[model samples]
Each structure stands twice: as structure tokens, then as C-alpha cells.
Target: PVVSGVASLGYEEQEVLKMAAAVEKTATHPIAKAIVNEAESLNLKTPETRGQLTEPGFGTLAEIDGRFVAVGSLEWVSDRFLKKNDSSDMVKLESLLDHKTVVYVGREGEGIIGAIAIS
Candidate 1:
């Protein structure tokens, strides 16, 4: 499906840009770091560039402080195998977390922040 523009969701260009910038600036979590690192390693610099790919299916941004952050949409994959295995396949995403998933590393901050999920 060709998904164009954020207006349908009530998000203006400036709003998305602000959110993206905030995510990149405030990302202190390991996962967020990895996402940014990988993106850099592969030369994915802009949201428009990221929107053209389909591998990791995500994108990252950095805060003014240089902490790596990420913000991208995702889709649920429900194949026959997944159904047969009775898997929830719930993509449990976090802005930041410890190895045990107990400690939160993504610190709360001003400007477009928080965790979200789609199933």
C-alpha cells in the first residue's frame, strides 16, 4: 500500500520533524543505540531514505546531546506458521530497557516522547 503524508493522522510535517529530532536527541537506551549505529553503518541518513527500504523496517534519530533514538511504524506479520504455532508475535518494543527488561533506559523528556505498540 502506498502510504503518503501524515495529515491523515493529524500530524503536521513540523510536528513529525520535532518528534523525530526529539527521539534522536534523547535516546539513551541500548536498543536505540543499535538502531542508530546500524543505520549509520548502512548510510541511511534521512527519513526519506529510510522510507525506501524494507529490511529492519525501522528508522532512528539522534538528540542534540548525541544519544541515539528511534521512531518508526511497524506492521504485524501473521502467516500460517505463526497461526499454527499459536504465537502472539506481539512486537514488544521499548525506547530503552535493561537486559532483564526490568530497568527503563529511555528517560522521559520534553518534546515527542513515549513508547507505543501496534498489533
Candidate 2:
């Protein structure tokens, strides 16, 4: 349930729960939707798995080795708006290894608009 960010760094179990619920409602990927459901049922409240995407700005939800890993861009602009500027605004998939403590691969100069994390 860790909300890792700059300046506003903190963790909230309830927030995680709410995000999980949102993910369940909004995620388009089938696997991501399933993971959200499982986490909601099991009450998973921790970050799991790690990954990175090579694309400029996008987000994805994945499961690795039975652990859920949600990686994607956290930008201030909406997908619709970003697409107008860069049609390739599609979400990218990344893999996070143990050595990679933090990921700085998203769009620069953008605020955290939305995020999708896995348990």
C-alpha cells in the first residue's frame, strides 16, 4: 500500500484499496482486471513485482511469477490529449528487477495524473 512519489511520499492501505477498486473498474487488460479482482478478494496491500517500459509515455499492468506488476507512465495529460500531441501515447510495458529500486522512464515535466499498480 505504498504510495511512492516525490514530496508526497506515503502509504495508505485504504487508498490502495480504492485504487485497486478503480483498477478493477477501469483497467482494459484482461489479466490486469483479473489481478485486481484477486487482490480485492485476498486484500493484498503491498507493491509487488517491478518493470519498466521503453516507450515514451504509457502504462500497463502485468503479472510476473505470480506477482502483479503495474508499470506505466504517470503523466498529467490525459491519453486523449497526449495522443493529439504524440499519437504513440499508448502505454508501454516494463519489467522491474530486484536491483532497480526506482523507475524514471515516464514523460518528463508532467504531474502524476493517474497510476496503475499491481499487488
lDDT of 2 by residue, 1-119 (tens): 32232111132434434433333344555534654565566576534434422233345443333433333433422331322223222332122122112222122222222333432
lDDT against the true structure, per candidate, is: 0.30, 0.35
Q: How far is candidate 2 from the true structure (C-alpha RMSD, Å)?
A: 12.6
Worst 10 residues of 2 by lDDT: 92-101
* Model 1 lDDT per residue over 1-119, tens place: 11121210223434443334344433555544443444454454433322211124344433434333335432211110112211221212222211111111121132122232211
Off by over 4 Å in 1: 1-22, 48-119
> In angstroms, how far off is 32's CA in candidate 2?
2.4
lDDT of 2 at 58: 47
Q: Judged by TM-score, which candidate is best? A: 2
Q: Which residues of candidate 2, in runs, are more than 4 Å off?
A: 1-8, 43-72, 75-119
TM-scores for the candidates: 0.24, 0.30
lDDT value for model 2: 0.35
